[PDB]
Each structure stands twice: as C-alpha cells, then as structure tokens.
Design a binder for these strands. Structure first.
Lengths: 271, 46
RNA sequence: AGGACCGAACCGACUAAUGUUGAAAAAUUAGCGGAUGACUUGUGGCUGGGGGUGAAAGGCCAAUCAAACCGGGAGAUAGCU
RNA sequence: GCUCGCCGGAAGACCAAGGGUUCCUGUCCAACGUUAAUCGGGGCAGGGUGAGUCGACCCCUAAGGCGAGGCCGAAAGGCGUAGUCGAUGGGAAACAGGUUAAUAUUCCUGUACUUGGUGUUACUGCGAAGGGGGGACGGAGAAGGCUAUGUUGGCCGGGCGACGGUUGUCCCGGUUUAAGCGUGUAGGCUGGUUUUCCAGGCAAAUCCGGAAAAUCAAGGCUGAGGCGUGAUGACGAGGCACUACGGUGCUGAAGCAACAAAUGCCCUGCUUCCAGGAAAAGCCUCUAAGCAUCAGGUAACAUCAAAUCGUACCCCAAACCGACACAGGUGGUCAGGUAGAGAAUACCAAGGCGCUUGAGAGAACUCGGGUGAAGGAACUAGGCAAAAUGGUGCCGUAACUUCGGGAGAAGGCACGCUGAUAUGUAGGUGAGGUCCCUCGCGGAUGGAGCUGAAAUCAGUCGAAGAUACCAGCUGGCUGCAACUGUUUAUUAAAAACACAGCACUGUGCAAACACGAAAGUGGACGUAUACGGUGUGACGCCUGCCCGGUGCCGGAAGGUUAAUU
RNA sequence: AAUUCCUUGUCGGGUAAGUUCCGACCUGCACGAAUGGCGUAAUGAUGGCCAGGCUGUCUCCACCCGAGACUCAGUGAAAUU
RNA sequence: UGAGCCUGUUUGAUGUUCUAACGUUGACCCGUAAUCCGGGUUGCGGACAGUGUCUGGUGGGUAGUUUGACUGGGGCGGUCU
C-alpha cells in the first residue's frame, strides 16, 4: 500500500511509503545467514574503481535457491520475509522431508500454498519445469542461460520474460528491454512474474534517505577546473564543447558493445 | 593548538623498526648504508 | 513521530576592541550558529608524487604544494648584476 | 601560630596514553629559579616497588598483513589456496580491619573462592580433523519494584556562655559494619510426559528436523532487592599513666525508626519503527574407525601445584605535545548542603590554593569599568559600538497559506510577608488490631504516625515583592537561493557546492566502465522496477521556429585509396 | 532589471529637502523558455529601504573607580650604525 | 561461380555439413581435510573467437617545442629589397 506522509516538517513533506502488513515481524532464519562486509568501491590495490559508494547500514546475507533442484518432493509455504540485499521479497518453504529453504516470491503467493519442481510438475505459479515442457506464449521468471547453472534473467521486482517460438533445440524469448534472444530448451524457468510491483512508486524525500543506502554525492564536471575534467574552466558559466566522460569518451549517443563471441544468439536488438 | 607529533610506541615500531626494515630489499640497503657510515644506533627500537 | 522547537556538556567560527620585537609563528575578552543527527570522539588499518583524496576553494598530503621531502647527474646554463 | 581572600561538575580524588627516579631522608648554595634565598621538580650520598584471585603472557577471532606447492611478469618482483599472525572485541576465581618517612585487594589478623596432577574406595560404554544447541548482538519510548545518598525524630556523651535573655519547643557531637553461605520475593518466558514412523543434517546416531495416536494439566528456565549467618568479633566521642611531637599498654556508652529519592540495578526485559541491525573459541549434547579382562567416564576422601614480567611518582599538568617553570591542545570513572526545571547561575562542605620582583606618588596620554542637566541619530559609507527587552499562570491576536503554519504574532493583568478556611486542607506512604489460609518474603478490613502542593477571604511594610546572579527588542516593502547541510587549517561562509525530484544516452552478464605490461580485482555474491555517464535543481502553469556548420546514428549502388603478388 | 551606455530618462508615493527605495510606462545600446521562463507559503550569523522604544554615536564634554606611564632598591634586551 | 593444362587435371571466391587443433568465469570423480591449481569423464561453441609480425584510419588522453624587428614607453596602425 502506498501512503503519503503529512507535512509536519520540510523533510517529511514529500515522503511516500510502501507498507505491507503480511511481512514477518521477528528475527530471520539463522542456519541460512552469512556475514557481508563493505568495500567503499575499492579493489585489492586500494583504489576507487567505482564512484559514489560508501556508508550505510549493516546487513547480513540470505542464501537463496536459484537452482531449484530437488524434483518430486512437494513443499509448503511458511512465511514471507524482508530482504535488504535486493528489491524483491523472499519466502520460506518447508519440504515434506524436513528441510527448509529460501526462494524468490512471485505474485499472488501466500502462506499455506504447495509448490513443486520437475519434469512432471503441474503448470501453475511457483512451479519449476524445463522449458521443453512449457506451452508457447507463457510468462516466466528466473530463467537460466546454461543447463544446470542457476537463474540469471528476470530476478528484480515486477519483471518477467515471454516465450514466443520453439524450433529445434532452441527457444526464442522476449526480454524486458525489447530484445529477442535464443537459449537452449533444456534450461529451467518458473511460472508467473515477480512480486512487489509497488516498489517503483516510492519517493525518498530527503538527502539522508539516499545516504542511508550507501550513495554519496555527485559533483558535476562543469564545476571543476581544467586539470580535473574536460568540462572545467570559465569566467562565469560556459560550456562550448561536446559532452564527454571524465576520461575522454563521448556520452549522449555513442555505442560501446563489442562481443563477437555471442552475436549469434541475438535475433533483434532493443528498439 | 594541536601539533604534528603525537607519540605511540606500537606505531613507531611497526613503521620504522628493525624487522620492518629487514622485511624488504630497500630496508636492508638502509641498514647497510648506516653500517658503512658507522652509526651507534641503527634503528628506533630500544 | 520528526535531517521538529528553546537551552548546558560537546562540535563550530558571524561582528567588535586588545595584541603586532605578542602570554600565543593565528590567541584573549564580550556578544554569535548546531545541539537524536547528512552528528560527535578513542584504538588499529588501507590509498604514494604527473600519483592519491576531494558535498569542488586549485583545497589537503608532517608550521613546505599550478606538481611533497631526501640523496645523486652537478662546479647544469647565466650575451645579466 | 592567629586573622583575611579565591575555586568547589573544580583551580578536588583516581586512571589510561606518554615520560622515566622527578618519590623519601640527610647535607650544600658556585652555575639553573626572569629579584633575595637558609627554600626547590637544582648539586652529592643513602633508601624505597613483596600477588593462585589486579593487569600483561596464555586460549579464540574482526578490518588487514605474510603466505609451502600454484598462476603471472626482461631481472628486481605481483596476486593468491591449505596454513600462520593481528585488539579497540569473547574466555576460571577475594573481601573487611590494622600497619611505613616513603608499598598495599600484594604485607599482618579474621572469614572465603577457582583450575589442573597423583593415590585409594564404590558405579559403569568410552571415543574426533565430523553432526546439532549456545555464546549472539539495531534506533526510539513508557512506568512498576528497588538501592547508593540525603533530612527529621528517638537514644548516648558534653554545655549553662566576654554585652540584654538562655533549665528549655535550648546549643555541639556520634548513631559504622564487607565478600561468602541459606531463603527463591516484585516481575519476564515457555503447555508437560509415553509410544510408532520418516526421500532431510558429505557416512552414523538414542542428538536436531518432520508426521501420527494416547494421556495430564501444572511442569521447567530466569530474576534485582529484603531477611538470617558471617559478628560473644571489628570500629567508635571519651578516660586511666608517659611525650622523640611520628606515639605505647589498657579501658571503652548509644550504635534505632519514619519520610523523600537517581541519568545506577531488575532490563540483553516490555511496547513500537524501517534504514532490517559481527566472527570464532571456552561450555552442553550424538555418534564413526578403535578398545573392551584393558584404556576411559561420574561421585567421595588425601596429597601436590599455580611459574615468568608490571607495580615508586606526575597525569587538564612546572614531570605529556608546543625551542621556555609558555594565558594554547589532550580520552575514561567518582557527583555533598541551601534556593532553582536543571550537570545553568550565586554562597558554602571535604579538599586545594593567594598564580617567584617589591615600596611609594596620586600629572598629560593609552587600556578595562560607573554616573550624567536640555536634546534624542542632528554622527557616520552604514544605528559600527553602547543603551534597551528578558520568568510563570490567565485574557487576546491580522494579511497570506502547500491547511502543518505565520505565533512567544501584536498587547495586557496578578506576583512579598502574616492569620483563618483547616490547632497541616485535596493527595502520597502506612504500624497496631479482627478474620481466612495451601500456613508464607500470603489475602481482605483497619486506621495510629510521617510528608505535603495550588486557591479564596481579611490585615501589613516599603519609592520599587519575576527586587541580587540568571534571563527573546518589535513592526512594514523589496532582490537571490525552496528547506536541514558543505567549503578557501592562517584576510572571502555567500547569491558558490550538494540535495529530494526530472530528462537524454550506454549496458543481455565472462555486462558497459575502472585499477593493472599479465594473472587478477571492484561493479555485485547484483540481473533492465538493476547498474555507469552528462545536464537541470522542492512545488504550481509551461517549455515555441531552425538539420545549412561541427558532432552522433543508419546506408552502400558509384569515385579515390595500404601492406602484399 | 545581480542585465540600460546616453542617465540622476519620464510620471506617481514617501521627506522642509530623497543620484538610494516602492508602483507604473516601453525608446530591450546588449531579456527569453532544462549552460531553463514567470510565480511561490515556510526557512537565512545573506544584499537594499522605512517606523516605535532606547541611548555619550553626536551638539560638547565633566567627575569618579582600577592596571600602566613618573620616583626608589635588584636583574637586564632589540631593530639600525 | 570468372579464369590454365594438356568432358579429364591445379590453383581462387560464396554457401552448407563434420570433428580432431582451440575456448568453457556448465555438471560429476581424485590429489585433499581446500569455491586457488592440475588430471579424468560428459555436455555446449568450433576452424569462429583470441594472440604475434606487418599495414591504412582516428587519437589535447599524455609528452617535447615554436609564436620577428623598428617604435619620441609597450600595444593597435604603418614599414622591411
């Protein structure tokens, strides 16, 4: 639910929140946690290699099953949960034999549901099948790119992929960017689409909100000197030159893809 | 007014100590140079 | 509840007078801003010079910065005093 | 030695970091001490630091450092696996009294506790480099039970006052006692027990996880404080005889209750929010290969052991960082009385100091303050500087607005003391007595004693009752940036930088991009509702015409065009 | 007009008197639509103008309380020549 | 598919198919007590990708330098046989 906040303060005038009363309140599951430390953008040489990163809140890592092995055993949904490492909720499931696991949460999945994976599994949301057994014209998410590797496509909040044609040992897919791609038919996928589609209708409200998440200020290149950027200098406000990156390449139009190893799996590019 | 020198034995020894000098090729050159000149104190270690 | 309000500890530096071979190679006295947050402080660690870090002033890198300090090429060159 | 002044959330007491004999006693005054010096943190000589329980060493890990074989690089070298180091973090145990010129949880007296080795007796499935539990974790807010501590009364010992009164509702002093052991309260959390079965925990499990019957409703874990013992002891004003001025031996009264009360304990608890809040060991459990007469395990007695290094002194300062016995800088703990909301401000307690040149005079001028007849910005680039307002409770308050604001808008009235209401009122705590009871740190009734606001009526003093220190000046019209924030250490704090929001463009994962001769690493244990670059800067109404020039994107039929033959 | 040289343009308000301030005119030397245009409640140790109160800022200065300056005893520099 | 030789013989370019060099930052076994490294089996791309020598294009991202004299002061004008 999207809720606006009352203007009791200038930093609270423009705040919109997303509230879900079904998420669990309490501690997470312990056997599936790990420690994660921060970096600041620095690599093993100690240098800033990506900019505008640093600070924030402490976080712990939740292990998730992007494989979806374990065919033939039904599982029951126990509780939905919050995750600070991604933009989608997660769900805890208990298997018929006494093992628990974390999975991504699709749309319309609630406590008390039954899920399954395998060649012979049903066709309903939350179920996993190799893409050689799904009808043409279906909506899937968590798609693999190599047989047995793990999901890599359509893992963010609200997203999904569509199956268009099947011919041979390959399946043709339409992605969220407007692109057509080909992948092997022995890969896996999950029915339905990812949940928490309200994620994009939030407004932060103040600079501290972005600072809480680990984002540091951005400085324009036209405010610097000629020794710092190709956009610096001037007596007053001046540009008079073609826009470029901080290292001398042209933004606003130029292209940067160069990969001759994978050009044969692209059918049509994003328009 | 805070000044530049603020002593700490741990940092002093980890920075300019005998073992620190011996851990690297150039530190051995520092030691050889001082030995040739004929100094009474080689390093900062007591 | 709140980058909410008044105000000590703590963190700053807007006006005036003294001082200028000073008590002090940047301070003192009377007033002044923030004060549950993008806050403040102890201990240890990592980034090395055409390089680093920079909410960006050519700012800072041991009272030294439009290219640190130290030792060498070196008695560089000086139609100039 | 007697007076006087200053600090008292410090200008008192104890530590860490950092120094290293500055500590105590004897003797000296050349040089040091901004002056004299018999004095010194100065010269010379001797003395002083006592640990199973305080720390370090030791067992375990964070960020990070090194790194056998390994991958990579003209040499030099770079990055990393198995490992091995690295506290600011986790891991056993001790309290009171007396004592030296200088040490004390270490020495003496009294009463305690913790971990291992060895021998004997009695019962017996033990076993790791493996599996499970636990350690183990955020911000804010609320009120219930307590203690440290204070005030008054009661009790014991003295006093009868340099000048009017003071045998009393009078004046001064004391009323202190720990760790350990037993009791398990205020309160917090969780239903207990038996049997069968099972695609899970790299193999095994009586341990963890899951499914199914029966039975029973009270079992278990946690926990400040109070109470008894420790204690026929110790301490305690004074007194009985001598003094080197540091003291010896003995003797020793009372040693109770009521009220108020923390930012400390219960509390790592309870309620609520999104930004979703460390690792490994010590410790408790289960087994595998293996040994079963053995070895080993739990319980009781006796014996032994706990080694090595620090311990003096300063520590908001004359002993540390500033060349100086320098008006500067420097992290943690302790928190008395009267007014007061208060750790602000004023006077005091315990304790500590008067800051290492003095004595006179009472000119101009300079520095820090007080008062001013009539006028009231006439001064000046400019009300720069000074003067002025300043508390609580009640009445009352405009344009505009994003409906939260503006607002403490503006402007007014009361404020001391004594008596009555009421020999201390409305509230707060609460003994005795009567019953009930599973008989206890219980339940109901009961009111002795203690403490104590705000208000109304009527009197009274002064020029002034928020009387001292403390403690907002207010209103009208305009330019710029929406707002809280940042910046030129040492002449510029702003209209400059950032910002929540908006648009363009790249990127299909071995992603674009960046540090690297390479191996590798960040982006990210992320996947187009995600990531990098460039411009504008909340919000409202909007954002028109130009593709000739320079860039960028798509085409590819024609002309020109490299090495090579 | 943070932009306008000629320029103290011209008209109205405020003062006894106003090269600054406020409201308009269009003759824009040389505004203008994300190197954004026109508005805007609340906020500012931000730039300009006007009132009430208050005063030694001023007509125009007078007295008083403290530390120096002067005299006595001890110690004892400096720039320049 | 256009070109030699003596419909038959070599050398070219375009396209289909294959596996055996090469890639694997897909799955499983061993060294081994290990998400590095090497070996083995099996899928997927496949003479593509990628590297060495040579060669045309773009290249203020970085580096070393040039930008005259006379002159009633220098600059702007004008001149220099």
């Amino acid at each position: 639910a999207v809720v606006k906040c009352k203007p009791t303060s200038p930093g609270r005038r423009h705040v919109v929140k997303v509230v879900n009363p079904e998420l669990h309140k309490g501690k997470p599951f312990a056997p599936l946690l790990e420690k994660n430390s921060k970096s600041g953008g620095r690599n093993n040489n100690g240098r800033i290699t990506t900019r505008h990163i640093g600070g924030g809140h402490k976080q712990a890592y939740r292990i998730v099953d992007f494989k979806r092995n374990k065919d033939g055993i039904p599982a029951v949904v126990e509780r939905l949960e919050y995750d600070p490492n991604r933009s989608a909720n997660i769900a805890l499931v208990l298997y018929k034999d006494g093992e628990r696991r974390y999975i991504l949460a699709p749309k319309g999945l609630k406590a008390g549901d039954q899920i399954q994976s395998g060649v012979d599994a049903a066709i309903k949301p939350g179920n996993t099948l190799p893409m050689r057994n799904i009808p043409v014209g279906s909506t899937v998410h968590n798609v693999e790119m190599k047989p047995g590797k793990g999901g890599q496509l359509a893992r963010s909040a609200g997203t999904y992929v569509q199956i268009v044609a099947r011919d041979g040992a390959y399946v043709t897919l339409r992605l969220r960017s407007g692109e057509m791609r080909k992948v092997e038919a022995d890969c896996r996928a999950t029915l339905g689409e990812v949940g928490n589609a309200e994620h994009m209708l939030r407004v932060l409200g103040k600079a501290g909100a972005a600072r809480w998440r680990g984002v540091r200020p951005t400085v324009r290149g036209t405010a610097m000197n000629p020794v710092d950027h190709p956009h610096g200098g001037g007596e007053g406000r001046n540009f008079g030159k073609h826009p470029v990156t901080p290292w001398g390449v042209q933004t606003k139009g130029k292209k940067t893809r160069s990969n001759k190893r994978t050009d044969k799996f692209i059918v049509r590019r994003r328009s | 007014m805070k000044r530049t020198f603020q002593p700490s034995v741990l940092k002093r020894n980890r920075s300019h100590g005998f073992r620190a000098r011996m851990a690297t090729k150039n530190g051995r050159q520092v030691l050889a140079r001082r030995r040739a000149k004929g100094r009474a104190r080689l390093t900062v270690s007591k």
